[PDB]
């Protein structure tokens, strides 16, 4: 059953066990599934490989607006991986998600999965709606359902103080672990996201914080999480491999 | 025989077929002995160890005042590992080495590395005095050996605009491969250091340059050469291994 913890002083999260914010950064992959039959047996591979949080991307899901077909899905995952938290990540399609609902049913879609209690953490986006935002944290909370909030650049990076001001939002709006991603045009932009991430970690979050300069050219803020404060990294099941990302992140830790 | 190239299209050193400044960073490991007993046994026991350039820390060295000791350490180090560009280095008292020596021992013993044949480089000081550096550069280029000139800050990080001049001068005084190497003392140093590394490589640099930010807090700094533009990492036999792993992966 659904149980989460957090501790602004430690800046921790901790779901279904994980201590997210404590230690060396946490791997999350993301099962991308069309139908049910997809999902399953892409959990079952998932299995196999070393992470700490499984992402369903339920973008890809085809029948995403049959609520029976979702909660079905989110229930064999569940059964597969029993003992990692699964986050719940609809992207949508304004955020370069796979296919596109209203602002309601992105919510009721999210409400659903709360419901649920098939999984640990729901994703929010940022730019959804301030006041349905709040209101779906809130019930998430009630529930003892985590929230990531997301926001994502695939054209560029903002300036840092913009990026570490999106992180501000996200924690006022309530998110459990702001996340940020952006795609670096040159060097110097990769800097300016560990930039805000030092800045934003150091100076304002009093939780876990998850960034990610994307692209070959990022990959650093993908395995130096632990020095700059980055919670959290994705890695590729079948990006840089979830193997290659444990021996990386193992090494850094190392006292 | 010594002999290198180097070449400005792709910034490069060529020396004992390592291509400095292509692909990966290269590792750099050293040698710290006092006696030459001690000298032979690390070479001896680094010999198998995968790492790429083999640096000779000879302020370590206590009879670095006398001649043939450091011409015969020299050899018995060539002879142990051959197959290596090996980097004649006395770090100055001033730039936190072991023992003193007068700027005009300094020289000489540079240009007794220079004239031995057994040493593919050696390590100036950016700054050791112009004059000397410009004189002592030359003499290592008449005898095929090529020049690391480096400079550090063991206690603070110097402002980016400021890590970008030294690394400036030390091409304009004709260094081969301009190094230095900071101490942070926030995090925010360590990224201070790795803007001025990418900002030199657009901006000044025609050859390869090498670049560090200390501490485990500056480890990043060790890895990431390959993306922002620092060509060698030293190492210990953060391990060998594990950088050799950590750049592999980068490599990729
Ligand atoms: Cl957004």
Redesign the pocket.
């Known amino acids: 059953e659904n149980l989460y913890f957090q501790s602004n002083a430690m800046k921790t999260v901790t779901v279904r066990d994980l201590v997210v914010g404590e230690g060396a950064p946490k791997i999350i992959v993301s099962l991308m599934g069309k139908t049910i039959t997809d999902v399953k047996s892409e959990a079952l591979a998932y299995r196999e490989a070393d992470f700490d949080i499984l992402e369903w991307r339920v973008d890809h899901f085809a029948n995403v607006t049959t609520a029976e077909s979702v909660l079905e899905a989110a229930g064999a995952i569940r059964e597969i991986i029993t003992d990692k938290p699964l986050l719940f990540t609809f992207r949508s399609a304004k ?1 370069g998600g796979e296919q596109a609902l209203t602002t309601g049913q992105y919510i009721d879609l999210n409400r659903a999965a709360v419901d649920s209690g098939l999984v640990d953490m729901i994703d929010l ?4 709606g301030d006041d349905e935002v709040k209101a779906t944290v809130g019930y998430a909370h009630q529930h003892n359902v985590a929230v990531i909030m ?3 650049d695939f054209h560029k990076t903002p300036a840092a103080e913009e990026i570490v001001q999106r992180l501000r939002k996200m924690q006022e709006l309530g998110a459990d672990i702001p996340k940020i991603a952006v795609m670096p045009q040159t060097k110097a932009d990769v800097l300016t996201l560990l930039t805000a991430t030092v800045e934003m970690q150091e100076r304002y979050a009093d939780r876990p914080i998850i960034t990610m300069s994307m692209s070959k050219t990022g990959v650093i803020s993908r395995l130096a999480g632990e020095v700059f404060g980055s919670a959290a990294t994705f890695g590729a099941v079948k990006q840089i491999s979830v193997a290659d990302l444990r021996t990386v992140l193992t090494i850094l830790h190392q006292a």
Not at 125 to 128: D, H, I, K, Y
Request: aromatic share 12%; charged share 10%; hydrophobic share 40%.
């Open positions: 955020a986006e940022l730019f959804t997301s926001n994502h």
